Paper text:
The DSF receptor RpfR is conserved in numerous gram-negative bacteria, including, among others, Escherichia coli, B. cenocepacia, Cronobacter turicensis, Serratia marcescens, Yersinia enterocolitica, and Enterobacter cloacae. BDSF binding to RpfR was previously shown to trigger its PDE activity, decreasing the intracellular concentration of c-di-GMP and favoring biofilm dispersal.
Without adding fatty acid to the crystallization experiment, we observed prominent electron density in the PAS domain core that was consistent with a 12-carbon fatty acid ligand. Intriguingly, even when an excess of BDSF was included during crystallization, the electron density was consistent with a fatty acid that did not contain a cis-2 double bond. These data suggested that RpfRCt(PAS) copurified with a tightly bound fatty acid likely originating from the E. coli overexpression host. Thus, we built and refined the 1.5 Å resolution X-ray crystal structure of RpfRCt(PAS)–C12:0. In the RpfRCt(PAS)–C12:0 structure, the C12:0 carboxylic acid group forms multiple hydrogen bonds with a set of conserved hydrophilic residues (S169, N172, Y183, and R187) at one end of the ligand-binding pocket. At the other end of the pocket, the C12:0 hydrophobic acyl tail is surrounded by conserved hydrophobic residues. While C12:0 is an inactive isomer of BDSF, the RpfRCt(PAS)–C12:0 structure provided the first insight into how fatty acids interact with RpfR and proved to be important for comparative analysis. Comparison of the RpfRCt(PAS)–BDSF and RpfRCt(PAS)–C12:0 structures reveals that the ligands adopt different conformations, resulting from the absence or presence of the cis-2 double bond in C12:0 or BDSF, respectively. BDSF was shown to tightly bind RpfRBc (Kd = 877 nM), while C12:0 (Kd = 800 μM) and trans-2 dodecenoic acid (Kd = 150 μM) were found to weakly interact with the receptor. We propose that the more electron rich N202 amide nitrogen interacts with the electron deficient Cβ of BDSF.
Numbering used by the authors: 116 to 206, 213 to 224
Write the structure that this text describes.
């Protein structure tokens, strides 16, 4: 393998359903992209409190959002890890979430 990425890159629709899920996301979670496409990111990867906040953010973003950053605790194969997500529309029906593990 020539190189590796440094970010967890997840693309979502307005419902939080997953459209793409990169290799580092697979490494953190133990789940393959093919296993998670169409699945809901909030219920799959967040505690109830984080999911509720995150779902409201995404729904609000699709209404009138500008690109933004947020910190989210995420359930991984070694417990919860904190990520900075840089979120923006595709250059709109999909949201690109560009995450760094900031734990
Ligand atoms: C480790 C990969 C799995 C986590 C992907 C989560 C997507 C984050 C969406 C955050 C939106 C928000 O809370 O404002």
């Amino acid at each position: 393998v020539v190189s590796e990425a440094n970010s967890v890159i997840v693309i979502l629709d307005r419902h939080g359903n997953i459209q793409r899920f990169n290799r580092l996301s697979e490494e953190y979670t133990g789940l393959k992209e093919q296993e998670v496409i169409g699945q809901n990111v909030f219920t799959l990867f967040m505690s109830p409190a984080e999911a509720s906040a995150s779902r409201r953010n995404v729904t609000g973003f699709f209404r009138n959002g500008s690109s933004y950053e947020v910190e989210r605790w995420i359930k991984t194969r070694k417990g919860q890890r904190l990520f900075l997500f840089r979120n923006k529309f595709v250059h709109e029906i999909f949201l690109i979430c560009s995450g760094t593990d900031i734990t």
